[model samples]
Every structure is written in C-alpha cells, then in structure tokens.
Target: QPIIQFDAESWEAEFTQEIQDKAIEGLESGSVLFFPKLNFPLLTEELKFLDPTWVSGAKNISYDPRSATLKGVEGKSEDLRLLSGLLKRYAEKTAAFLHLLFPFYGSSLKIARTSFRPVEISGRATSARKDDTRLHVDAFPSSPTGGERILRVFSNINPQGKPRSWRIGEPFQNYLNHLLPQLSPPAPGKRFLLYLFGITKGYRSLYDHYMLELHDKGKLDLEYQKNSPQVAFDFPAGSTWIVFTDQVLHAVDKGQFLLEQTFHLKVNALKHPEKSPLKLLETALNKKLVSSESFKL
Candidate 1:
C-alpha cells in the first residue's frame, strides 16, 4: 500500500476511534500514514535559532551532513532550549496518544532519538548510495534491535509553502522476497566475531544483519529502482505523518525544515507480530534465528 492519508481537520482535534484503528491496521500491514490537515504550533521561529551548516558528529548513526540531531541540545542557547522544550513536549504527547490507540504495547514504547533536519533538498551533495534521495528503508548500523519495530512521527514545519516530498515503494515483504535470492550469505563466524569485539555500536543480531543487507541490496539493484511499484507524495506544510519506516520502503526526494521523532517498540507490541518483517523472514527461511548469548550486552 502507498501512503494512507488520515482525514482529520486538525492535529489537536479528537481523532475518531475508527481512525485510530485504521492507523494501527495500516501500520501493521506495512503502510505509511499521513495527516493532511493536522495542526501544530509553527516551528519557523524556533528553527531560526539553529545554524544551518552545523551538522552532528555523532558516531554509529548515518544521515546527511545537512541534518542534525538534538541529543545534547540542552544549555546550547536560550532559543534552542526553548525549541527543544516545545519539541520534547510534542513528542511526549504524541507518544501518549499512540499508546492510547494501541494499548497492547502499553508503556513499553519509547523514543529512541529526535532530529531536526533543516537541509535544502536541492543543494545537498551526496553520492547515489549515500543520498537519501534514493528509495530505501531505515536501518541502524550500530543500534540494532532484536527484531524490534521502528515507529516514526514526522512533522513538516517548513515555514515556506514548499512541501516535503517522498516516493514510497513496494511493501517490505515483497522487496525482501525479490532481493533475498540474489544475496550471498555472510562468511561463517563473521557476525559472531563482530559482536564479540564490539565492532558495531550495538550487538548486531541476525535480524540486524539481514535488515542492513536489504537496505544496501535494494539501493544497488538498478532494475528494482526503475520498475518497482512506487507512489510520489507531497506533504504540505504544517502537517504530521507517521510510518513503520523499518517495514516500509520509502525515500525523501525533497524536503526542508522537518522535525522527526523515532520510537522503538518490541516486536510483540504489534497487534500482529506475524506481519512484521522479522517474522516474515523467519517464516521464509524456515529456521529459528540464532544469536550469541553475549551479544545482548
């Protein structure tokens, strides 16, 4: 499925129970959700406090040089502190609302990271593989989860009328099925050694290995890039969107002045764990996924 638009007048307004159910259902089935008319405070004033050229040097994370995460933003400046405060409140409220919508996950849902991406899409210079302009799924090189789900909430706070554009490709399972046949298995004991020596920021579970492989494989596949099923979408200013990014094949072609909050939920948090990419891969391979006991550290 392409992006599922939630018809709502404002973000502050109460969403119908049916809408919440549909949102959960769509996410579980590997689709992106958009709120065409969601309302939130204008962040243009706060964004002015940030320097556009300032990029984060955080390790174990991958992003464009134009983007910056708000990890150690406290005490930076009065304006930045105010901006971060407002965003933090918004993230908390959004998480609370989502918890209400999907109670099965309970309070286990937690924000993993937040970023303020203020780069101009057109002026950004990057190689085809490193460029986010190309279609791909979200995967962590260092912070691998043991089959956890990645739920992201994004707001296009672009002060100008410019819209954030994206091209969402086919479903996660379909992409994996198509690429798996061509992938060569990793050398014996390679994953084990990597984990044992702390080569990665976090333990790279079997699931993480496959997800990273899928991210690269999909991008390198020229045929899949041209002919795959995809739909272009333009998110208007002052709107919010959500997606299980790890389970959806998507790419940001153009956008600016965006705020994003990422949350990681346990695999069992989903109403249908069977629908997750991890489960689908397990079933397809017809074997129990293995992990080293020490990898959890």
Candidate 2:
C-alpha cells in the first residue's frame, strides 16, 4: 500500500523550517505544496506514452464521469509493474515529507498504491480553457463507503498551453456562460493548485473553505473579481504535485468537467473506515459505468 499514518512530533517543525528556507510564498497558509526536481523521470515518460491514445484490455476501464470507476490505465496493471514499483516507493517518500511537515498529527493514513490509466476526452479545448480550475481533496477516506474516483497522483503530459476543462457545464451548456464577464483568461505556464482535505459530517469541514490568495495579481477589483484562490502557477511537463487531503483546501474556482463527475459522499464513513472501494468500483464497472456512451460533453 502507498498510504500510511505517522507520528513525527518534532518533524513538523523541521518541515516548516524547510518551507521557510525555500521562500515558497504562502507556504504557511496554502494546502498544496510544489516540490521541484523530484526526479519522477519514469512516471513522466509513461505519461507521455499514454497521452492521446485509449487502451483498456481489462474491460474494467471506464471513461464515464459519473460512476467512480477505477481510472482507466491504457493497459493492464501488470504491464506497468516497474512504474508501479517506482510509484510505491514514491508514495513512501511523499509520506515522509508530510511526516516532517505536520509532525504533530496523531497519525497519518496511507492509501493504496494503484496504477493510473489515463482517460482522454476529446474536444476539451473547444469546451474548456486553462483558467478553468479544479480544487479538490482526495477521496481516500470516503473510498470505503463509495470508491476511489480519481488519480491519487497525476502528471499532465499535454503541453501547458493546451486548454483543458476542469469541469464543463452540464451537458448542452457552455462553461463560459458561468464565468464573470470581467474574468481574464489564464496565460501559459500557470498550473492550478491541486488541494486536498479530510471529509467529515458528510461535507469537507476540515478544509474550512479557505483558498489560495493569489494576492493582488489580478487586474480587476479584488471585491468584484472572481474572489477565489484561482491559483495558477507555472508548471512544466515533468512537474508533480503530492497532496495530503486532510491538510489542504481544494475547491475549483469555476467550470465543470466536460461531463458530470459524481460520487456519493456517504454518511456512514466519517473518516478512514475499513472497506474496499475498488470492490464497489468493480461492481459499477460491470454495471456499465465506464462506457463512453454513458458520458457526454
């Protein structure tokens, strides 16, 4: 498994010191932290190979946005066994980073290390743009009640300038219609901050609904402009974001997926309960969840 909880009482102070040393602005308040030169060369290479093509030998691969189908990998899980090995190792290192940063927590929860299969939706540029945002916490805790709905970690292989919709408006509706008229589009090189948080009381309460304050970078009035974090940082092809759901505020500023992305945030599972989310996904896939016809932009 790639996920685990830790008790590093003194490590949190060291983690904070490292962030201060790096001069990473907003490090104290922001939930998502970007680590440069993490050396994920193989993962990047694999993502490049997976881009633009569709591969699903297991029949379990799903493109449907509604069902929490296991994110489709272009090929079998065993095909990328080497990459999987690397990811599992990466997961352990990532946990260590978190342990050093937030040392006081009683413990941390480690999630399963599964292989990711990309699911491509065509016509995204025509429907979505760079400024469109996606702020979300991982669904690990909720996995037992429902199932995993997204890639725990993902690398964007497409060029930075390519317009991709975080979430498009409901089918037959345009995402632009929802944006404020004065909104300025995102320029190249800005990557949206991928936030995370733990779930509680049937909603994301641990996050406190806070956002990354881009801090006077926008052209419009701070009061009248789209008053959300709108975190757009420059990210390259090999750049990576490792997020801990419990510590960050992840919410998209605007836009919907080209299709609807739904998951039943069940009430029974308050935090990390013991249940196999993949099993439910298996059931959903068999019931035709990942079928392309099931989702429409």
Candidate 3:
C-alpha cells in the first residue's frame, strides 16, 4: 500500500470509471498515487530557477494563492512575478484536478499554500522537533485543522533528473496505535496561553491536539523510528504524485527543486471516514475528539 501507480499524460486527463474508483479507494486507504510519467510544464524562464541562490537563505520559497505573492526569494520585480505566476498556475491546475477527481469533496477542499523547495534535504540541520528527516505524519502548529484531511500534490522539478528520496513508513493506523500510548492529552492552561498569544489560530481541538502530539511523539521515539517498518523510495524527476500527508508517515532524506501543493479536505469528504486518523483516535480513546460546534472547517 506504499504507492499506487497512476499513468496519465496530463493532470487534466479524465479518469476512466474503473481507474477513478480504484484511485479513490487506494487513496482513502492511505496509499499514494505516484504518476511516473506525468510532468509539470515549466516554461523556459521558470527553468532558469534551478539554482539554490534564489532561495535567499530560506528553506523554501513559498507562494500564497490568495494574494498571488511569492516569499523568501530575491529577484527583480518582473522575475518575481513570473515565478509566482508559475506556482499559481501549478496550484490552480493541481487543485482543479483534485476537485475533478474527488467530486464528492467539491467546494469543501481548501487549496492551501504552495511552496518551491530549492534546498537539498540530505544532512540538513534542524532541531529534532522540526527535523523532517525523521519519519512523522504532517501537522501544523500555527494553523490547526480540527479534523481536516491534508491532501498534497508534489512534483520533482529537478532539471538534472535527480530523484526525491523518501522513507515511507508503516500504515497510518499501525503508527497511530503504537504512538497513542505515549501521546499527551491537552493541557488546559497551556492551550489558553497559546490562543491568547496567537501562537495558534484558535484553541486546538482534541483532534488537532492529538495530531500534533502524534507528530512529535512519533518523531521523538527513536526506538519506533529504527524498529518500525518502512521502505526507501525514489520519486524520479518530471513525475507527479498525490497523497494524504496527514495520514502517511514519511521522511525526506534527499531531494531538491520540488514543487508541492497542499489541500485541506473536510473529514466528511472521505469515502471511508472511519479510516481517518480522527475517527480512529475517537474510537481508540472512546471519547469525542472534536466538538461539532466548537469551530468550523
């Protein structure tokens, strides 16, 4: 269930009924749809941005779709506009494809931020808590999703054909079950302080709280890191893939020049809601993880 190969010429390609059902089932079951031959059509000007110099001492250059602005890069106004335009186009196309692919999730999926990662991943220095080199599922500190599913589209744009290497770990349920015992419950006073200081958008829901705990708990457990089941994968250049990063435990050890787009899908969008981390946690803990009226997705 690590990867489900999807063959297509364009992101806009219409899926046959069989393939469409297969894709939804595979994805809902926590498998990635890796498109080996798919390509992100980058123009000649965008092609010149392969160098790491444009990163401007930042981890990755980011684009906000709402305002159409690119950050963490130094360049002329014209050049900046062009680069941002490319990212915007990529984000729109990728989001549109997901909307088409998952019709049930229409208008519920929120197209989030897009980023162009120019730095190499191998030997990158970071605190253990922030290290992506260790296997962990996706979670955010500043932005918390009550129970939303994080769907992401990624492409290796390395012009020289250097593949992106990742270590895909055990199934989501297995990882969650192993880590839940060590995960912490919400600290009432600390949650209030975080919301008061605006460190978090709002008070973290039980679902969000558990997800963040699982993210850190999974990262800090070296015993689990070494002993857990995982496989190394190489995503070749000029290829596209999509997965629910929120469910998949992944570690990136190598790669550069990557384009990634993230989407937030409501819990109800899934074909199998019980398979999601939110429902699984609720079932395990025997309590409602999120209040229905506490916050809106």
Candidate 4:
C-alpha cells in the first residue's frame, strides 16, 4: 500500500503486536504512515512563530541537538528560548515514541535535528538543488552518511486548516533501474577532493555519491520529472506522517507550516536491511559501497 492510515488516539498510544509488526513490515518496504486526525497542540504564544515575517535567513528554522540551539528564526531571547524548548521537547517525545513502537532500534537511533518550516511551498522560486517541487529522494550535501537511512516525521501545522501536499512517485528500486545504467562511477581521488575542498563534511563514499547523483538527477531531468508515475497526497492539518525519504520518491506539491524531526538509523537496525538504498545499490552495482576495513581517522 502507498499510504497507511494509522488508527490511534494519541501518536504515542500503545500498539498491539499485530499493528506493531504491520507498521514495521510496511515501513521497511517503503510506505507513508499517518495519523490523520491527531493534532500536535501549539500554545497561543507559539502560534506567533508560524508567521513568515519572523524568518531571518534560512528557509526553515531548526533546533540542532548537537549545538543545543535554534537557527533561522530571529527574535527576542525569550522567544528564541521558547522555540528551542518547544522543538527539543518534540524531538525527545518523537524519539521516545519510536523506541516504544520499535524496540529493535534499541537506542541506536541518532537524533539529527528538528526543523519548523513556515515557508509557502507553492509558487516559490528556488535553484535546482533546492527545488523540492521536483520528485527526488533526499541526500544531504554536507553530513554524508556512509549508508545510514534517513527517517523523518512531518506535521502539517497550517493554521488556516490547509493541507501540505506532495507528489509521491515510484519505488526507489524502480526509479534507480530507470536512471542508474547510464551513470558513471567516481574516479580516483574524487572522494578526497570533495573533503579537501570542504564541499562535503566527510569523504563521500560510493553510496553517498550515487545517492547525491540520484537526488540531483531526479530534479534536473525535466522530462522524467513530468512523465514519471506518481500520485498526489495531501496531508491535512493536525496530522503527522513518517517516511523514509531516502527510499521514497516524492516532491513537495503545496501548502506550508510544518514541524519535523529527523533521525539517522544504522542499516542493520532494519528488519530487512536488503530493502535499504545502500543494499539495493550494492546489489545493482554488484559491489559493496562502504569500506569494511578498519582505518584510523
């Protein structure tokens, strides 16, 4: 199934083994899960942050776990503290809920960051790299994960009762099959060059290189972007959905006002690791993508 309409009162509510297993199986195979009617309540004061006028620099305001600070929103110290505290609390709550729902993760889930995006997605002009309106899988330019999976939870907090919509495309393997044959491999010193020039945070592995290419190629190919098999999904206000963005082919269609938390999970944490982009790429390329040998950093 493309979308799993999960039935629950609270997002953190206890789940039966049947529902738990079903969720796990569906996610591993790539499915968007949502709690349609569940609303993440926001205080009146917090609602003020939703206005687009407060944004200073970045498109999204994010609270970084490592830095213990908020970015993109400019305001008084009191408001800054309020925003930071709110996102941090939501990050913790979401992580705890995931642990309860999927014990197999076993504290191995790495909390990335919580971002609050209030920008209007529709009719917004952006560069090719930043164009989320095109169907593509996510791959960070900085922060190169050797092969870890990116998991994200998104809440549509639009105050006007609008829905955040998306153009959902085909499965990862299918998209890769149509694109990978004509791609070329990285040359010698190519990975080192990126790190040397400070283009990438770390040495880009083969997996990272391909994922980045796929992400960009998906966006740049106007013909493929228009002709690809896809379905439109509108996540209504007061609803939250979780998906493996690295595995799903999707594009932002419209609407705005969103809160999101990101997590990076080890490949082995999956019930079926073979389904991951890393594994799928390895099979298609007929070689391992990550380094198996131990080396000093």
Query: TM-score: which is higher, 1 or 2?
Result: 1
| lDDT for 40 (candidate 3) | 87
lDDT per residue (tens digit) for residues 75-174 in model 4 = 8999999889878877877787777677777888898989988878897887897799999989988878889999998888899999999988999999
Q: Answer with 1 or 4, whichever has the higher TM-score.
A: 4
**C-alpha lDDT values of all predictions:** 0.72, 0.31, 0.86, 0.85
Q: Each candidate's TM vs. the true structure? A: 0.86, 0.38, 0.95, 0.95
Which 10 consecutive positions of candidate 4 have the poorest summed lDDT? 288-297
Local error of candidate 4 at residue 197 (angstroms) = 2.8
Assess candidate 1 and give its lDDT. 0.72
Off by over 4 Å in 1: 9-13, 43-47, 54-76, 290-297
Ranking of candidates on lDDT, top first:
3, 4, 1, 2
Residue 102 deviation, candidate 4, in Å? 1.5
lDDT of 1 at 228: 93
- Per residue, candidate 2 scores C-alpha lDDT tens digits across 1-297 of 111122222212354554443322222222334433332344554444344354345432233222222444445665445334444444554445445543432253333433333444343232121221333323332232122222133333343333222321111001112222333423332321112343222332111111111111221233423444333443334334433332232323322111111222221221322122222222422432221222325
Please give the clash total of every predicted structure, in order. 1, 18, 0, 0
How many collisions between residues are there in candidate 4? 0
